[PDB]
Amino acid sequence: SPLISDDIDNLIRKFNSDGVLEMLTSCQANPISTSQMHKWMGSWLMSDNHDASQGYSFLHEVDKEAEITFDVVETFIRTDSFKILAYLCQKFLDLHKLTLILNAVSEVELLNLARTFKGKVRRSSHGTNICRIRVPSLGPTFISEGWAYFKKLDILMDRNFLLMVKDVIIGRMQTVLSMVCRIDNLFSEQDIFSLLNIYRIGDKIVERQGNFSYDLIKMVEPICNLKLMKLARESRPLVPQFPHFENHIKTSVDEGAKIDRGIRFLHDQIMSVKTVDLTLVIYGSFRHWGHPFI
Numbered sequence: 510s511p512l513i514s515d516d517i518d519n520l521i522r523k524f525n526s527d528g529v530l531e532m533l534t535s536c537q538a539n540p541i542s543t544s545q546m547h548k549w550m551g552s553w554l555m556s557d558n559h560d561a562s563q564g565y566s567f568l569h570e571v572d573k574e575a576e577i578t579f580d581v582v583e584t585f586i587r588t589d590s591f592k593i594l595a596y597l598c599q600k601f602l603d604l605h606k607l608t609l610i611l612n613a614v615s616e617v618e619l620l621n622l623a624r625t626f627k628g629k630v631r632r633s634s635h636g637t638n639i640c641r642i643r644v645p646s647l648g649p650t651f652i653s654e655g656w657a658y659f660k661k662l663d664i665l666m667d668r669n670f671l672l673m674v675k676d677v678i679i680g681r682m683q684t685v686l687s688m689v690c691r692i693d694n695l696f697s698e699q700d701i702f703s704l705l706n707i708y709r710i711g712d713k714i715v716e717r718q719g720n721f722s723y724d725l726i727k728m729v730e731p732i733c734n735l736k737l738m739k740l741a742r743e744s745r746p747l748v749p750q751f752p753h754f755e756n757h758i759k760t761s762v763d764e765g766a767k768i769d770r771g772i773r774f775l776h777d778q779i780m781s782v783k784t785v786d787l788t789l790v791i792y793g794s795f796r797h798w799g800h801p802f803i
Contacts, residue, residue, distance in 0.1 A: 510669060511669075511801060512669050512670065512673055512709075512800050512801070512802055513669070513802055513803065514543035514544075514720075514802040516667050517540075517543050517546075517665055517667055517670070518542075518543055518654070520677075521540050521542065521543075521566050524538065524540070525539075527635050527637075528633035528634065528635040528636075528637035528639070528653055528654060528750070529653050529654055529656050531633050531635070532633065532639050532651055532656075532658065533635050533658060533665070534652045535639075536651055536658060536660050538586060538658060538660070538663065538665070539663050539664055540658070540663055540664060541588060541664060542599055542721075543802060544719060544720060545719065546664060546666075546719075547708065547715055547719045547720050547722065547799070547801070548715070548716055548717070548718075548719040549662065550674060550715060550799060551593055551678075551713065551714070551716030551717075551719075551722070551798075552712075552716045553646075553793065554600075554652070554677060554678070554681075554708070554712055555593065555596070555597075555705075555708060555709060555712060556596070556646075557592075557593075557596050559599070559645050559646045559783070560598075560599070560645035560646075561595050561598075561599040561646075562599075562645075563598075563599055563602055563645070564595040564596055564598035564599030564600075564601075564602065564721030565595045565598075565599070565795070567595075567598045567599075567602060568591065568594055568595050572676060573613060574623055574657060582692075583689075585712060586667055587696065589702070590685070590698055590701045590702060590705065591623055593705055594682075594685055595648075595650075596683070597678060597682050598682065599645055599646055600646045600678050601678050601679060601682060602679060603644035603646045603647055604644060604671070604674060604675040605675070606622075606626045606642070606644060607642070607644065607647075607650060607652065607657060607671060608671065608672070609622050609662065610623065610626065610628060610642065610652050611623050611652055611655065611657060611671065612670060613640075614707045615661045616638060619626075619638060619640060622640070623640050625764050627642065627643075627644035628640050628641060629641050629642070633653065634671075637651070637653060637654055638653065638654045638674070639651060639799045640653070647659055647661070647662065648660060648661030648662060649661055653666045654682040655667060656668075657671055673799050674799070675797065676796075677796075677797055677799045680794065680796060680797040681708060681794075681797050684704060684790060684793065684794045684797065685704075686792065687793075688700065688701055688704070688790060689701075695786055696786075696787070696790075700787055701762065703778070703782065703787065704787075704790060704791065704794070707775065707778050707779070707791060707794075708794075708797065708798075710774045710775050711726055711729070711769055711771070711775060711798045712798065713771050714726065714769050714771035714772065714775075714798075715789075715798055715799070716767055717771070718768065718769050720802050721801075722770075722798070722801075723798075723800070723801040724765070724768075725765045725768065725772040725775075726798045727769070728758075728761060728762065728765060728775075729757055729760070729775065729778075729779070729791070729792075729795045730774060730792070731754075731757075731797050732758060732762070732775070732776050732779050732780075733779055733788055733791055733792040733795070734792075735754065735755060735758050736779050736780055736782060736788050737785060737788055737789075738751065738754075738791075740784070740785050740788065741785075758776075778787045781787045
């Protein structure tokens with residue numbers, strides 16, 4: 510379903526002027542407006558000022574089972590990025606738990622989930638339930654009837670916004686996994702860091718421009734397609750230039766850089782990529798800064 514600001518807007522308006530309103534009151538909430546929520550996400554996605562112990566443990570259990578799998582393979586035939594990945598894994602675990610709680614179909618499943626994830630449930634005035642749970646990357650969280658309020662961040666999310674954020678984290682994990690789950694050893698850690706650096710540059714655009722960032726983030730697709738054409742012409746030098754598509758990119762980025770210089774950085778980083786293969790990884794990550802309110 511479409512990502513809209515309307516429901517969050519309407520609830521915040523009602524609050525500072527049903528069972529969820531009661532929940533916000535109890536927390537002494539002061540939710541930031543929807544026009545600030547993407548800015549928060551930009552600042553948060555690759556943040557590392559939180560507990561990631563479970564993320565480390567996760568990434569250690571997985572990489573030890575993967576190294577058993579690869580052990581089976583070679584039986585037949587015959588670190589720096591690890592930290593950044595641990596924090597992504599922590600955020601995934603946190604968002605996954607919150608989603609399960611948020612999507613509890615009944616009171617009985619809600620209670621089981623709350624027990625499992627060390628959450629507490631209490632009754633609202635309208636026969637509804639409020640579940641409170643602490644997660645390392647987001648702080649104390651209060652969930653009721655499709656809503657999640659983050660007391661430490663003063664952020665109110667509806668189901669869709671929370672899902673949008675989880676899709677970004679899953680996406681970035683997937684891209685990193687894709688670069689390591691190879692049988693041809695195609696990518697180096699340097700290549701992984703090239704991708705992480707691109708994430709970082711784009712996140713700063715989101716942090717600074719908020720919902721308006723996506724006008725610039727959308728340019729990753731045509732920048733990458735131009736880069737693919739330039740790479741192609743490196744190997745087959747007699748393929749004709751396409752001055753109009755190239756000039757469209759140039760003017761698009763030139764104008765966008767007046768809004769946020771980050772899109773110049775993104776353009777230039779993509780243009781510095783040495784292979785079709787890494788360029789396609791970046792291309793395939795074009796949704797990995799999320800989606801705007803529409």
